[PDB]
C-alpha cells in the first residue's frame, strides 16, 4: 500500500525508522499494532506511527 508521512518523525528504537514530513512509504505489513505500521524507506524497514502518517490504500 501507499503511505505518506504527515509529520516529521524521529525513531526511538532499533525496530523503528525515521522519516520527514512528506516521505513516500512502502507499507510492508500492518497486523500487530493498531497505532504502528511496518514500512520501507531509505533502504530500511521499521515501525512508524499511524497518527503521523496517512494511508492511500
Amino acid at each position: 500500500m501507499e503511505a505518506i508521512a504527515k509529520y516529521d518523525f524521529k525513531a526511538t528504537a532499533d525496530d523503528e525508522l525515521s522519516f520527514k514530513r512528506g516521505d513516500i512509504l512502502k507499507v510492508l505489513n500492518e497486523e500487530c499494532d493498531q497505532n504502528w505500521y511496518k514500512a520501507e524507506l531509505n533502504g530500511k524497514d521499521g515501525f512508524i506511527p499511524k497518527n503521523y502518517i496517512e494511508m492511500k490504500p
Binding site: 509529520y7 516529521d8 526511538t12 523503528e16 497505532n35 504502528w36 506511527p49 497518527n51
Partner: peptide, 10 residues
C-alpha cells in the same frame, strides 16, 4: 506541533 505518538508496545 505534531500529535502525541502512540505507546508502542501493545
Amino acid at each position: 506541533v505534531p500529535p502525541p505518538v502512540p505507546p508502542r508496545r501493545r
